[PDB]
Nucleic acid binder design. Structure first.
Lengths: 181, 48, 77, 124, 49
RNA sequence: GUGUAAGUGCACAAGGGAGCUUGACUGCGAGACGGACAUGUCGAGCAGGGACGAAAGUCGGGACUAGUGAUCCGGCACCUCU
RNA sequence: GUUACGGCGGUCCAUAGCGGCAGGGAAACGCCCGGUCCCAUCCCGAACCCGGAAGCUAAGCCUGCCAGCGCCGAUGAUACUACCCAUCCGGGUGGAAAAGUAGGACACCGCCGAACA
């Protein structure tokens, strides 16, 4: 019993990337490592309840309890003080990460209103992708009747890639809906 | 795994407009998930 | 003028120098920080005062880049 | 050319650093030597060190074929290795030691072998 | 006022009293601490008086 | 960055986090520093009874140096004193 | 006794570091596979722990070579200075820098243990 995305990466995607880049040793095949979802509330500095709403949204979508991030710096323009909750974060690894990736790619992304594609320019040197949503309605794990206010995220997919090209190739093989440039 | 810290998990069958039965884990408790659109039918994935 | 205020001199510094023979418990240096670190047979006090734990001769050395104070067990007659 | 550090780098540096931070309080003498244990994924090793002279009065490991023959688990191998270090210290004239855990946590194999040494006549 | 002088009579009689200060608004309730009592020779709890 | 001035320190952390806890002890104290005197300061180690730790061990408040007032007179608690 | 070996320590703790180029897996060192058991995440078997060895030296590690960056660093001379002369200017005896240069340097030593004799 294996996640189908993990099965695919193990069998066909690994061989494809090995052919494409001709890695000298078997352990250069760039694979994903973990997925991090960030929901920076910001407005929680006034009202604490928004952090709990973010907690519930992340727990329902990703499937595991999120970790509240403390404000490590005090600032007055955002009237931020040290220690109050600011955002939530979940680190996804292994089978849970694979199944979340499958769910998002095959269900959540096409549910985006006028979804035209994700720019393949968002990698940073080492082929780690970081995009960001605006609302949370795309997931059916949450309910539009249940929700009351949109809450975007920052999904980060750190891989074993060393270059932007290798990372974009691996993610494109994974089934990522990139644009064309 | 801390036991009482996470929500429930269940194998859920995702149903698209194409007719594909998708036995996979999720937290929705309906058993079978039905959705109108997915990667197998969306115009961007299908080039339309 | 605002000025005119100062505190008393604290008489800090090194009390026993290299080669001096001392008894156990004798104060070696009076310092604020850990300008000298304790070495062998040398303890550190609440106010970061170095003192001797055994009789012997004071020896100043450096351990991994820190200046240290040690006590050498002088030979019994 | 991988972009950053390997996981083995992080593990090795962290273990060396946290072995050093505990060596602040633990040092071995002639009559009271330091029992420092190095644990690997496939093996475990122990030595008896007199830190003033920088010597080694006794040593034991799972490398030895005599202790390789036990079919027991890794914990069983550690228990046996603790027994060997115990009676080799006995033959070395050493009675009391100080247990250096080598930057590993005190649990599992290391705890099992330390308890084996404690029961086998090494007071620490 | 705040951090005033407060007294801990040995719960086990003995009239053994330790003194110390505490913030009377951080800890409005009476302080309870287990302390050594000389005449009993044991570590008995002490209550704020 | 270290609660707080400045300085001497601290990345080996004395800086950040968590678990348990009250040593912010009782009887003492070799030896010292500083000093007109009165003050002040450090202190290993011993005993009792504890905390933490597998253990070694550490703990007589706080990284250190300010946060204070002699004597007289009187109040309160206890004592096998009168 | 020997090996491109693993550990535990050193040295007024870089002359040692960093970087570049070329190599290796005998036992070891690792990466690695998995979460059934001890144990763990302020969420995450990522880490800690446990159970294994299918794969791999791409990394760690260590070997050889590079002065490239850092680092160490004379002698001489000078600055400064104690004492003494000197009406000022300055001088005599002694001590003697920092900087800079010549240069050194891609560490050395100790104790165990692996594989080999």
């Amino acid at each position: 019993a294996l996640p189908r995305l993990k099965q695919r990466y193990r069998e066909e995607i690994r061989e494809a990337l090995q052919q494409e880049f001709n890695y000298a040793n078997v352990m250069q095949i760039p694979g994903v490592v973990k997925v991090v979802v960030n929901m920076g509330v910001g407005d929680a500095a006034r009202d604490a309840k928004l952090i709990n709403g973010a907690i519930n949204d992340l727990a329902l979508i990703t499937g595991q309890k999120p970790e509240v991030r403390r404000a490590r710096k005090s600032i007055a323009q955002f009237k931020l003080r040290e220690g109050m909750p600011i955002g939530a974060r979940v680190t996804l690894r292994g089978d849970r990460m694979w199944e979340f990736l499958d769910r998002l790619i095959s269900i959540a992304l096409p549910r985006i209103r006028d979804f035209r594609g994700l720019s393949p320019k968002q990698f940073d040197g080492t082929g780690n992708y970081t995009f960001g949503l605006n609302e949370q309605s795309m997931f059916h794990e949450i309910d539009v009747d249940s929700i009351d206010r949109p809450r975007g995220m920052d999904i980060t997919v750190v891989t074993t890639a060393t270059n932007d090209a290798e990372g974009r190739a691996l993610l494109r093989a994974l089934g990522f809906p990139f644009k064309e440039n | 795994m801390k036991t009482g810290i996470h929500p429930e998990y269940v194998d859920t069958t995702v149903q698209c407009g194409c007719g594909h039965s998708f036995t996979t884990r999720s937290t929705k408790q309906s058993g079978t998930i039905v959705v109108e659109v997915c990667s197998q039918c969306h115009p961007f994935y299908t080039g339309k | 003028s605002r000025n005119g205020r100062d505190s008393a001199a604290q008489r800090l510094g090194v009390k026993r120098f290299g080669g001096q023979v001392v008894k156990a418990g004798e104060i070696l240096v009076r310092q604020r920080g850990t300008h000298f670190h304790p070495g062998v047979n040398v303890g550190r006090g609440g106010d970061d005062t170095l003192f001797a734990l055994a009789p012997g001769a004071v020896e100043f050395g450096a351990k991994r880049g820190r200046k240290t104070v040690n006590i050498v067990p002088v030979a019994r007659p | 050319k991988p972009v950053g550090q390997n996981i083995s780098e992080v593990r090795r540096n962290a273990r060396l650093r946290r072995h050093a931070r505990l060596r602040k309080k633990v040092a071995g003498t002639a009559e009271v030597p330091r029992l420092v244990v190095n644990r690997s994924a496939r093996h475990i090793h122990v030595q008896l060190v007199n830190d003033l002279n920088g010597t080694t009065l006794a040593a034991a490991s799972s490398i030895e074929a005599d202790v390789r023959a036990i079919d027991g688990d890794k914990k069983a191998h550690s228990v046996r290795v603790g027994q060997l270090i115990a009676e080799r210290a006995k033959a070395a004239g050493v009675e009391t030691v100080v247990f250096d855990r080598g930057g590993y946590t005190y649990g599992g194999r290391i705890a099992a072998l330390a308890d084996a040494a404690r029961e086998a006549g090494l007071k620490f | 006022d705040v951090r005033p002088k407060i007294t801990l009579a040995c719960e086990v009689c003995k009239h053994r009293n330790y003194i110390t200060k505490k913030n009377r608004r951080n800890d409005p309730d009476r302080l309870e601490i287990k302390k050594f009592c000389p005449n009993c020779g044991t570590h008995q709890p002490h209550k704020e008086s």
